Design a binder for this molecule. Structure first.
Ligand SMILES: CC(C)(C)NC(=O)[C@@H]1C[C@@H]2CCCC[C@@H]2CN1C[C@@H](O)[C@H](Cc1ccccc1)NC(=O)[C@H](CC(N)=O)NC(=O)c1ccc2ccccc2n1
Ligand SMILES: [Cl-]
Ligand SMILES: [Cl-]
Ligand SMILES: [Cl-]
Ligand SMILES: [Cl-]
Ligand code: NA
Ligand code: NA
Ligand code: NA
Lengths: 99, 99
């Protein structure tokens, strides 16, 4: 599938067995998910955006499904306003920007 | 043209007669450029993202070139750490997300 950008590119994801909505974000290096209970070991990290940095929990090797595609990689969990799928997982699902 | 996402999707832009580098950002609603003198009328705005809000100057109807593509639209000028091309201009240059 090919998405225009007239609306936010929101898709369904599954993480921790839960369905959620998230933004496909080519401008994000990392994947940041809103506060949730997620099993697995983690470590503290800061991540930055406009407005400055926030403290998150970094979980490595998390299995996530993104619009039906399975990916495994690092997921950051913390007080983001919007769930973001960034380039570390967009590359694993084969997403590209075309134009 | 197809851009893979193993690295940040940075392109060259021309704005105000000056060349700059900017990120093609499907997760951004708006286009945000670092502090610069830009001629024209503007009005203040606040925009938000991962670390909170920043104040910007909103300029409408700015002529901009993005990776060789002309566009005319709203540019926000303020203390972003990275120049961002968001969906208001990605739709004009014909970008789509393919996965
Ligand atoms: C630019 C504006 C119009 C404000 N839009 C947004 O910021 C919306 C806000 C939405 C709701 C909150 C959750 C994020 C989403 C997506 N974003 C866009 C989104 O694409 C945003 C754009 C951006 C890129 C670079 C630097 C700053 C801002 N990316 C990000 O917020 C990601 C998050 C991350 N760590 O992966 N930041 C970066 O990948 C990133 C890269 C380089 C940096 C250098 C110094 C300082 C900060 C840096 N942040
Ligand atoms: Cl780390
Ligand atoms: Cl299944
Ligand atoms: Cl200047
Ligand atoms: Cl002027
Ligand atoms: Na789906
Ligand atoms: Na106007
Ligand atoms: Na794909």
């Amino acid at each position: 599938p090919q998405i225009t950008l007239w609306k936010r590119p929101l898709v369904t994801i599954k993480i921790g067995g839960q369905l959620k909505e998230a933004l496909l974000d080519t401008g994000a290096d990392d994947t940041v998910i809103e506060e949730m209970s997620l099993p697995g070991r983690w470590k503290p990290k800061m991540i930055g955006g406009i407005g400055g940095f926030i403290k998150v929990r970094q979980y490595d090797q998390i299995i996530i499904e993104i619009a039906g595609h399975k990916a495994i990689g690092t997921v950051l969990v913390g007080p983001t306003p919007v769930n973001i799928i960034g380039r570390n997982l967009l590359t694993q699902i084969g997403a590209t920007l075309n134009f």
